[PDB]
Design a protein around this ligand. Structure first.
Ligand SMILES: COc1ncc(-c2nc(C(=O)NC(=N)N)c(N)nc2N2CCCCCC2)c(OC)n1
Length: 245
């Protein structure tokens, strides 16, 4: 996350931290996700597509820091890794950038809700807020495009939903952005999602409740002028989400 503020997991208790075991022993951060039910984390396919073996991944819930344990955190194996059959990668855009991780502990239990571990609501079908709506993004992603390290502490910022029509202007993304994508940006382009934030939540207050509107997918740099964040439009994927859960 470029700009925004540091936060703790209590402010985004659905936030999942997804890591991969390396042949050797070492564990590296992959991507964020969102607890949508006790046993199910939703994320981005492009996070896993290079290493699509479920046994390689670890999910934490209730985790506020990258490389230290948070009091109350739960650690999970991936019992199922579901990648979107119709996934594709362009030079810039991911299509159908959506994935489901069925989580279970060594002792065979799903997530136990707590102050630091809550589920987020999916939206009603084809129902997103208007352009100009303020939504929150959360991630352990880079603080600057050029940074080598990810931040130790979880971050979150505010971005405004951009109209499909504004996001398809050639000097933005042209036709790279489809009806299954959402754009969000800061009016000053000063705050944004970035590398490491992929798969993490775009959350909007919708029908007066916190709703998983987007999944961090792609963008051309981070906090660049005329280069908004591009998000999987979760309201266009409910059948796929219902069916695979
Ligand atoms: C031109 O440089 C460039 N371009 C793209 C990325 C990148 N961006 C995002 C992202 O969400 N961007 C955004 N919201 N504006 C994102 N979610 N992920 C990004 N990478 C991770 C996976 C995609 C390609 C490599 C960079 C990047 O990160 C340092 N740097």
């Amino acid at each position: 996350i470029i700009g925004g503020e540091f936060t703790t997991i209590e402010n985004q208790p659905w936030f999942a931290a997804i890591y991969r075991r390396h042949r050797g022993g070492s564990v590296t951060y992959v991507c964020g996700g969102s607890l949508i039910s006790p046993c199910w984390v939703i994320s981005a396919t492009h996070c896993f597509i290079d290493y699509p073996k479920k046994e390689d991944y670890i999910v934490y819930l209730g985790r506020s820091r990258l490389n230290s344990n948070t009091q109350g955190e739960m650690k999970f194996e991936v019992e199922n890794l579901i990648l979107h059959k119709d996934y594709s990668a362009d030079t810039l855009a991911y299509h159908n950038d959506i994935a489901l991780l069925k989580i279970r502990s060594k002792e065979g239990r799903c997530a136990q809700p707590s102050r630091t571990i809550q589920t987020i609501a999916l939206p009603s079908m084809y129902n997103d807020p208007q352009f100009g709506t303020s939504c929150e993004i959360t991630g352990f992603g880079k603080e600057q495009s050029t940074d080598y390290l990810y931040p130790e502490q979880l971050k979150m910022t505010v971005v405004k939903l951009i109209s499909h029509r504004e996001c398809q202007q050639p000097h933005y993304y042209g036709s790279e952005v489809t009806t299954k994508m959402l754009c969000a940006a800061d009016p000053q382009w000063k705050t944004d999602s970035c590398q490491g934030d992929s798969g993490g939540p775009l959350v909007c207050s919708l029908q007066g409740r916190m709703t998983l509107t987007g999944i961090v997918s792609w963008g051309r740099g981070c906090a660049l002028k005329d280069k908004p964040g591009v998000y999987t439009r979760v309201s266009h994927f409910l059948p796929w989400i219902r069916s695979h859960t």
